Hints:
Elements: E1 4-12, E2 15-22, E3 25-29, E4 31-33, H1 46-52, E5 57-60, H2 61-76, H3 78-83, E6 89-92, E7 105-107, E8 112-115, E9 122-125, H4 127-137, E10 141-143, H5 155-178, H6 180-183, E11 187-192, H7 198-211, E12 215-218, H8 226-240, E13 247-250, H9 255-264, E14 268-270, H10 273-280, E15 282-285, E16 288-291, H11 318-327, H12 330-355, H13 360-373
Parallel strand pairs: 4-14, 5-6, 6-10, 10-11, 11-12, 12-13, 13-14
Antiparallel strand pairs: 1-2, 2-3, 7-8, 8-9, 15-16
Helix pairs in contact: 1-12, 2-4, 4-5, 5-7, 7-8, 8-9, 9-13, 10-12, 11-12, 12-13
This protein binds one RNA strand of 19 nucleotides through helix 10 and helix 12.
Amino acid sequence: RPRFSFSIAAREGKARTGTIEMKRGVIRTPAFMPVGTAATVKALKPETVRATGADIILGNTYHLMLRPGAERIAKLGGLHSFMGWDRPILTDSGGYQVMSLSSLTKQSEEGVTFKSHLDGSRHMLSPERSIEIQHLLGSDIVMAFDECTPYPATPSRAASSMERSMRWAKRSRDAFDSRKEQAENAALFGIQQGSVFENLRQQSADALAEIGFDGYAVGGLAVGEGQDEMFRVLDFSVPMLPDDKPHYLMGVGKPDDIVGAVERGIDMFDCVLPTRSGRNGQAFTWDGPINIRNARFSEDLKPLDSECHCAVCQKWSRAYIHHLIRAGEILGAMLMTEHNIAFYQQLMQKIRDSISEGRFSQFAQDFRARYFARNS
RNA sequence: AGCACGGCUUAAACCGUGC
Ligand SMILES: [Zn+2]
């Protein structure tokens, strides 16, 4: 019933576990949100995604805009209906495509005009349009339109991009409030930029706080500066942001990264790793990452992870999946990904449990320990 | 093709190293 209602229920240091209440469902936090870029979480049926424990999936604007197209999905009944996921969905503004598809992109002030990475055509993605697109889709959590600042970057672009991104953060807000159908049902998040310079991360925070958002996300990180630098930034960045609103670290997601970011104060995560690595052949277990393609697993009858409760681990051997993935079989990508996502969820679960038991810091250290041991 | 590995923080059921 409530549009957006963040409510922290426990804390331990800069970390905290809570719940986000939206019209489409409840979101347990800290939470990990699987990435279903083009209206699908690679190799997984919506129900399976839910089966693993995800309360919310993330969809991308840039891609959806091009295919199957904003207006078309809308004409079909909204993304949710289109793909078969009735729980909340968070759509990215496409600010990531501005820095990864930068190749075929031309920046300005009105927005970012780029060429279809497959079609070749031309599209002008503006703060206005991005928010319109996200409205058409029917996304529950709308992300402002930003520009993920590449790394490394001189204090020049570091500020240009940032400042321009804020100007855009305002245009989004306005756009988001222009339609009451969207302002009454969805939520809006703002993205903090400024690379690794704090005096800049400060400005961005303030600019964002002035405008007013339902949730604040730290972006521009995990863009290749190593865990070290990132944590170093999160150390002063997350604190600049409004404490009574959720904090969302975009793109980050690697067991140890997530665990650390939580200690730093993050509430939400979204990342390609689990779903991409599944497809490729890498599985995430309590004993570190393992590449199921290795010769060793050829006759290994144990499951990907003996602690995992996932449906895969309850029924298939390493050797079976070894065989499949290695042979190009699709069932492999299905089992791998289902495992990895279920895993990230179980991880998010355990973190939450610990935070509301005041034993998270203990959890974290026990985690890295066994995680880096790799006695699997 | 294949074998032994490695990376991935959606232009990746993909790429890269060695034989
Ligand atoms: Zn599993």
